[PDB]
């Protein structure tokens, strides 16, 4: 667009403006047509130095670069297709219990419109791969994604809960002892 932040600084300011003015597009074609036809969606953001900049399609585009890794330069299916293939690789009897329970974690997941967009993408991917165009039984899918305001610290809360639970028994841990002997190998006790 013309604005450059080549300095090592301003990275935090760009991060702040991203977390402040960003949202996923429930309908990418609709958002593109809106940005191309209307003057709305264009915002003006100030900087710490004092100058001001204008932001447009990038707002709804960066969640697409998240969704489309090929846009960034990586060869991967994405996120919705990734989790879909991961679940399909499991046993059928588990698949349902996974579509009914889906949680998220991390500040990157707080992009506006991400959960419902992911749900719609999963629904479309199922409709395409499995039913091949038979919407007669699509409503009988029962997908229930989960989201909360504490995904920013879900890992921390879980670590605290696990520490409070395991603070009694010291066997499950790896004491300072038994380290010089086979310390590294002790770390293999967690992941076989």
């Amino acid at each position: 667009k013309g604005y450059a932040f080549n300095r090592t600084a301003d990275f935090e300011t760009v991060r702040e403006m991203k977390e402040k003015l960003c949202y996923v597009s429930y309908d990418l074609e609709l958002d593109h047509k809106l940005s191309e036809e209307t003057t709305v969606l264009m915002r003006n953001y100030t900087l710490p130095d004092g100058r001001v900049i204008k932001v447009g399609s990038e707002r709804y585009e960066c969640p697409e670069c998240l969704f489309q890794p090929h846009l960034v330069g990586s060869e991967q299916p994405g996120l919705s297709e990734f989790i879909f293939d991961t679940i399909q690789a499991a046993d059928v009897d588990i698949r349902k219990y996974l579509y009914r329970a889906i949680v998220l974690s991390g500040g990157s997941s707080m992009y506006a419109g991400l959960p419902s967009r992911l749900e719609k993408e999963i629904k479309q991917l199922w409709f395409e791969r499995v039913l091949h165009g038979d919407p007669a039984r699509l409503p009988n899918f029962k997908v229930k994604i989960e989201d909360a305001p504490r995904r920013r610290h879900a890992v921390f809360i879980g670590g605290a809960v696990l520490a409070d639970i395991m603070a009694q028994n010291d066997h499950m841990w790896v004491s300072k002892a038994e380290w010089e002997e086979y310390g590294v190998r002790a770390l293999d006790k967690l992941g076989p």
Binding site: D85, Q88, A89, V92
Partner: peptide, 7 residues
């Protein structure tokens, strides 16, 4: 995966 059901 490519068996129209399982796998």
């Amino acid at each position: 995966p490519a068996w129209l059901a399982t796998c």
